[PDB]
Amino acid sequence: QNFRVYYRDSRDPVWKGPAKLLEKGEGAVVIQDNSDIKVVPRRKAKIIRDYGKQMAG
């Protein structure tokens, strides 16, 4: 169930990632890109689960 997050920082159109998911809130998600922790509005983050990979290793 390892999650990866791809996100955009405010006022920056360049999508970033992969980043680790620390917490997922109602309106915000806490993540870690490299070493920097960030709080991103939920709408600016795509959380991707390795679901397919788990379906048949």
Binding site: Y6, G17, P18, I48, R49, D50, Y51, G52, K53
Partner: protein, 148 residues
């Protein structure tokens, strides 16, 4: 391995053709995408990985292949990306040849593209014991399943 694919984009029209080649077999899949973007490539990749075993994809450094959308698809499906053989260039040219041979049989390029993919995968090598690319990939995958 039965999971190694090479992907690239070619152009014919003024439209974008996304091409995928199963390196071990020569089997190909291609499609005209409305734009040479990561979103289209990612959707293309998700479809491929659901039809065939896709474990590693080799591509160049085009923005569409390095997009976060493709990285997301690969993570979800368990695909390892390698941005590092001319197996794909040999195939993209052969796709263009077949398309030209059959172009008059279809109005739209996308129709001609699928005709060319059909012909390339189903032809069969002339010799004794000859097989088609479609048969080779099925054989490669079939034998891999037995060793499980």
């Amino acid at each position: 391995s039965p999971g190694i694919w090479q992907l690239d984009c070619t152009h014919l029209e003024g439209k974008v053709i996304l091409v995928a080649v199963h390196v071990a077999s020569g089997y190909i899949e291609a499609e005209v995408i409305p734009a040479e973007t990561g979103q289209e490539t990612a959707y293309f990749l998700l479809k491929l990985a659901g039809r065939w075993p896709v474990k590693t994809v080799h591509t160049d450094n085009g923005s569409n292949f390095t997009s976060t959308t493709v990285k997301a698809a690969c993570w979800w499906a368990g695909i390892k990306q390698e941005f590092g053989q001319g197996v794909i260039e040999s195939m993209n040219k052969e796709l263009k040849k077949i398309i030209g041979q059959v172009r008059d049989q279809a109005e739209h390029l996308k129709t001609a593209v699928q005709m060319a993919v059909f012909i390339h995968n189903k032809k069969r090598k002339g010799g004794i014991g000859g097989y088609s690319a479609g048969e080779r990939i099925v054989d490669i995958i079939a034998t891999d399943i037995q060793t499980k």
